[PDB]
Write a protein that binds this ligand. Structure first.
Ligand SMILES: [Mg+2]
Ligand SMILES: [Mg+2]
Ligand SMILES: [Mg+2]
Ligand SMILES: [Mg+2]
Ligand SMILES: [Mg+2]
Ligand SMILES: [Mg+2]
Ligand SMILES: [Mg+2]
Ligand SMILES: [Mg+2]
Ligand SMILES: [Mg+2]
Ligand SMILES: [Mg+2]
Ligand SMILES: [Mg+2]
Ligand SMILES: [Mg+2]
Ligand SMILES: [Mg+2]
Ligand SMILES: [Zn+2]
Lengths: 81, 215, 222, 125, 55, 97, 25, 129
RNA sequence: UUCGUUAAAGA
RNA sequence: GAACGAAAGUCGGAGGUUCGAAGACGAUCAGAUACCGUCGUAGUUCCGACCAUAAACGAUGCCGACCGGCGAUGCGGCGGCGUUAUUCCCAUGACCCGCCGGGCAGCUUCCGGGAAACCAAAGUCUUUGGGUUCCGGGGGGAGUAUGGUUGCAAAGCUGAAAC
């Protein structure tokens, strides 16, 4: 949140979900920050570089997370062709 | 990619354990994992989309920093044998038997952990860690079947968790890929022991019978 | 002057001085368990008030058995308030239990403007609602210097929340404080849960404190 | 009559958990062993604890106990774990299951070594 | 085990009966507590056996 | 409030069910509501089967039966030890073994 | 007293008052 | 039977937003609906949308964002004069800075922000935020 | 198989 | 405004087995005229006319759209070198698997509602508006009196006020 002076007045910018683009609440204890790391070339070396997939509570309870992780990583190109 | 592809030894071990066959009932989120129905009720799960979820489960487990932050839970005896030899081998903390519900919730009990990742065997037999995930904020990897619910589940690996050989093959090959990602075993190196430890052992009737037949 | 008795790993990060602010905990929505954590992060959050201590009964063969149900609303005036409900057979025991449960149930309060972006936010960002029982509480943004036109209990709760100007609309049994104060609590808790039009872009996705200071947690656990 | 208190059974389980090799199958010896290794003032409580200790000894001599296991039974379970033969890890290289997985091996590129031709009716369930 | 005192307090409303009972801790060596252990409490020892079997 | 979803009987599509008389109290109850069981009794008590088999003309060439549509109501069946009361979680059950 | 028999006795009282009106119009 | 097809579309939009889906199937088509979704596109609450041109009546599929809170149709389409929009501002929009109301101006389907610059006013289709 | 009724408050 | 409208009841014609309002007795109780037993009138039966009420219940208005799943069932339609039925390839029959449409329904669920019971509707409701009809304004008085209207009658519709 900005004013006319242009200052950052907001306390914290919460996690927007990667499934349904919904704001994860501060008391939403059913949320998760999935973490999947990158894989190197033919030699197959582990990297410290990783990508974070925020999945919120109602998606996790309805079960849309299982389809959502694969349909999000398919746009990345890391799960399949 | 190009090294994470399945090979002939891998598909020979999958068809030997018989993980291509599943249950008879369907689920509304297993349609993308099933391939085609078959007569006599038993349905067919494809192998490539199982290998990809095994790969993502291995990526999730190797993405941890403290190996004590990964808990492995199974309540049925077809998985309790595999958990103790799985998690004590490479990178996790095992617990089996009775779950003692309320384990990850209250802090008056000395049996309290803060896992940053969870791998369970059967969701229907392990509904209680799925319930307690909502207070600890942990991900969940589950060896699911064609008739298992997918509440509080992040990675679902479609399989048959009834037969012990498929369960032991999946724990074996999951630890195999975890160790090849961590760097203990190279890619052009087979595993040193045959996984029956991970599968099952029938107790002392036919075990001592086979021992007396071998001696 | 007592030892914190290291447990639960979040306060162990706090005593290892790895989480600089409670805003960093509310970014990731980690479950707070002990009440010493926000006492360590906030020293001026001791401003509280007991709202109503009412007796409840349990009919037994020997007679009616009483126990007192205490309500305590806590909060610093910067926008971090909480509510606590505790029933116990002793007065001061129920009061201390409600204080500790309010320290547990503290939430952040989002503050917005009436429509002119000068500075020092004084109101809720939009018209939000809260429901507990049949009690529908609607919080509506107000102009600058308007005040809190409400019942005295959520007036004190919003005065602790820092919402200096607000309009309220209550439907239902407003007479029951155990539902009306919790409906006001839900209404001020949904302020961050509302999808607001200054959060368009994808967030930074900063690292977890567990990932950032795993090795300190390893050397303090083993 | 032997519907013993939880503290009595808990003390006897602590005895049989800590010290097993000092105990035998005789009551008059096991009572003196338990009073050498523990402190019980009441002689009736001595007899009660020692009787349940002899009962646990007669249970362990027959089979395992779900409540507690000794280090020797733990080593026997570890032996039954790591006793690893090589008989049924991988079978012979003749495996036939399904025409559906035959079509899987035809479409998705793999070996498809053995023959696959079986016909089944629709009498499932 | 339980020191029990029953005393009176004379106030303007009348008399007030106070009953204070305190259970004593078990101290075998010293005059702080009694020397008799509790009949419900069973005392055990630490494990003793160690290394060096045959050869 | 409503104690059950079925409201006692099984009338859901139709609007009227012809009543059938009870056995003990002889009260007209609709047949989707009355306790309608099918008792299958041997006509001979099991200790007299041996007596009639020893005193029979044929060498065990007849075995008669008795099939009766027993038709109680819910007012008399609870008194007559059939449809005893259960729990709220126990009202969602099926036929007993 | 049941509402059924209360309504029936008020109905009988209505019939009695109607016969009273017909007797003395 | 079949009337207020813009409300018939926005009920499906609302239930798909509350469920958390990706795209909606909408069986009617109106120029009202196309210009309404065009205003929503121009504000950026929804995304790209494709209209299967059936010979009888097409089908609109809208790629959602996960962004909408509430969208609906005021039923009788009230005739709103200027210096009376502030009642609907205080009644419908959750704040002063947020949300918009689709006015049916004489020069076309316009917006709450566009109407005070065009100086036309008119009827109201609905609101969205 | 038959077996009716016990005012008003006052915790 | 109009057509049907259970049972009971009313007016004619026919008959009358069982049950049976009222009624007469026999019992138990302090007392029964009641629950129990015996007999039995109107009725319960059919064809003509009237009455229009019920816990007439899904205690839940009608039409349209959306929003999870599972296994079955009733009726059509479609697909499946499967099995069993005539004489035989050619058509219908019975069983097994799946889909479609509307129908009575069942189980789980944090989809959401509601005070809860509970509900795939009682959801899409303070983030309040798809179209439309009838009804509630604390409880009694009271669905009562007086009006009006329909009916052979019992009665039905509309319907207060004082307190
Ligand atoms: Mg009140
Ligand atoms: Mg009742
Ligand atoms: Mg009916
Ligand atoms: Mg009397
Ligand atoms: Mg009739
Ligand atoms: Mg006649
Ligand atoms: Mg009689
Ligand atoms: Mg008779
Ligand atoms: Mg008569
Ligand atoms: Mg009526
Ligand atoms: Mg109607
Ligand atoms: Mg059919
Ligand atoms: Mg045909
Ligand atoms: Zn009966």
């Amino acid at each position: 949140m900005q004013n006319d002076a242009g200052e950052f007045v907001d306390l914290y910018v919460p996690r927007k979900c990667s499934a349904s683009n919904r704001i994860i609440g501060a008391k939403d204890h059913a949320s998760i920050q999935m973490n999947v790391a990158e894989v190197d070339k033919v030699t197959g070396r582990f990297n410290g570089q990783f990508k974070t997939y925020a999945i919120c509570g109602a998606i996790r309870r309805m079960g849309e997370s299982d389809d959502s992780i694969l349909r999000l990583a398919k746009a990345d190109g890391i799960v399949s062709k | 990619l190009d090294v994470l592809q399945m090979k002939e030894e891998d598909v020979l071990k999958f068809l030997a354990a018989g993980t291509h066959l599943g249950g008879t009932n369907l689920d509304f989120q297993m349609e993308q994992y099933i391939y085609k129905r078959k007569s006599d009720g038993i349905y067919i799960i494809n192998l490539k989309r199982t290998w990809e979820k095994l790969l993502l489960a291995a990526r999730a487990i190797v993405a941890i920093e403290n190996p004590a932050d990964v808990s492995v839970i199974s309540s049925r005896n077809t998985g309790q044998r595999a958990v103790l030899k799985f998690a004590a081998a490479t990178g996790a903390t095992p617990i089996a038997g009775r779950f003692t519900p309320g384990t990850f919730t209250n802090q008056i009990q000395a049996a309290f952990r803060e896992p940053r990742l969870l791998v369970v065997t059967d969701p229907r037999a392990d509904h209680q860690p799925l319930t307690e995930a909502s207070y600890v904020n942990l991900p969940t990897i589950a060896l699911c079947n064609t008739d298992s619910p997918l509440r509080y589940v992040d990675i679902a690996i479609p399989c048959n968790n009834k037969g012990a050989h498929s369960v032991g093959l999946m724990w074996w090959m999951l630890a195999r890929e975890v160790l090849r990602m961590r760097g203990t075993i190279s890619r052009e190196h087979p595993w040193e022991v045959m996984p029956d430890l991970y599968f099952y052992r029938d107790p002392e009737e036919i075990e001592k019978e086979e021992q007396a037949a071998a001696e | 002057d007592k030892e914190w008795m290291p447990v639960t790993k979040l306060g162990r990060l706090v005593k290892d001085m790895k989480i600089k602010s409670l805003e960093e905990i509310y970014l990731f929505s980690l479950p707070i368990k002990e009440s010493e954590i926000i006492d360590f992060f906030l020293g001026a959050s001791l401003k509280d008030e007991v709202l109503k201590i009412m007796p409840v009964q349990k009919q037994t063969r020997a007679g009616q058995r009483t126990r007192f149900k205490a309500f305590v609303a806590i909060g610093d005036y910067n926008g971090h308030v909480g509510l606590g409900v505790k029933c116990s057979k002793e007065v001061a025991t129920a009061i201390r239990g409600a204080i500790i449960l309010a320290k547990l149930s503290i939430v952040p309060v989002r503050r917005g403007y009436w429509g002119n972006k000068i500075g020092k936010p004084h109101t809720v960002p939009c018209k939000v609602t809260g429901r507990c029982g049949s009690v529908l509480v609607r919080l509506i943004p107000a102009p600058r210097g308007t005040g809190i036109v409400s019942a005295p209990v959520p007036k004190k709760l919003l005065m602790m929340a820092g919402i200096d100007d607000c309009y309220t609309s209550a439907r239902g049994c407003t007479a029951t404080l155990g539902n009306f104060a919790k409906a006001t609590f839900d209404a001020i808790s949904k302020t961050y849960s509302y999808l607001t039009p200054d959060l368009w872009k994808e967030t930074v996705f900063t690292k977890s404190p567990y990932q950032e200071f795993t090795d300190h947690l390893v050397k303090t656990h083993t | 009559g032997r519907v013993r208190t939880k503290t009595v059974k808990k003390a006897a389980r602590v005895i049989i958990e800590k010290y097993y090799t000092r105990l035998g199958n005789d009551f008059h010896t096991n009572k003196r062993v338990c009073e050498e290794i523990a402190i019980i003032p009441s002689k009736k409580l001595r007899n009660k604890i020692a009787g349940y200790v002899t009962h646990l000894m007669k249970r362990i001599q027959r089979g395992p106990v779900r409540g507690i296991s000794i280090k020797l039974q733990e080593e026997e379970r570890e032996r039954r774990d790591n006793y690893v033969p090589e008989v049924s890890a991988l079978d012979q290289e003749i495996i036939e299951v399904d025409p559906d997985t035959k079509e899987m091996l035809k479409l998705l590129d793999f070996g498809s070594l053995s023959n696959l031709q079986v016909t089944q009716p629709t009498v499932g369930m | 085990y339980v020191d029990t005192a029953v005393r009176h307090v004379l106030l303007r409303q009348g008399v007030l009966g106070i009953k204070v009972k305190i259970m004593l801790p078990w101290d075998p060596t010293g005059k702080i507590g009694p020397k008799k252990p509790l009949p419900d409490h069973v005392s055990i020892v630490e494990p003793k056996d160690e290394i060096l079997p045959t050869t | 409030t409503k104690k059950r979803r079925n409201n006692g009987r099984a009338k859901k599509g139709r609007g009227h069910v012809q009543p059938i008389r009870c056995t003990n109290c002889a009260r007209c109850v609709p047949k989707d509501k009355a306790i309608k069981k099918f008792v299958i009794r041997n006509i001979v008590e099991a200790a007299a089967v041996r007596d009639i088999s020893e005193a029979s003309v044929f060498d065990a060439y007849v075995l008669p039966k008795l099939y009766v549509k027993l038709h109680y109501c819910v007012s008399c069946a609870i008194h007559s030890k059939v449809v005893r009361n259960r729990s709220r979680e126990a009202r969602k059950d099926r036929t007993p073994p | 007293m049941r509402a059924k028999w209360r309504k029936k006795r008020m109905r009988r009282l209505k019939r009695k008052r109607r016969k009273m009106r017909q007797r003395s119009k | 039977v079949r009337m207020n097809v813009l409300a018939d579309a926005l009920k499906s939009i609302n239930n798909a937003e509350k469920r958390g889906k990706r795209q909606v199937l909408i069986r009617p088509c109106s120029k009202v609906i196309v210009r309404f979704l065009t205003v929503m596109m121009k504000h950026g609450y929804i995304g790209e949308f494709e209209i299967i041109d059936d010979h009888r009546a097409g089908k609109i599929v809208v790629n959602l964002t996960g962004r909408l809170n509430k969208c609906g149709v005021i039923s009788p389409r009230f005739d709103v004069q200027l210096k009376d929009l502030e009642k609907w501002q205080n009644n419908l929009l959750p704040s002063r800075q947020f949300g918009f109301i689709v006015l049916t101006t004489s020069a076309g389907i316009m917006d709450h922000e566009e109407a005070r610059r065009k100086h036309t006013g008119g009827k109201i289709l609905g609101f969205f935020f």
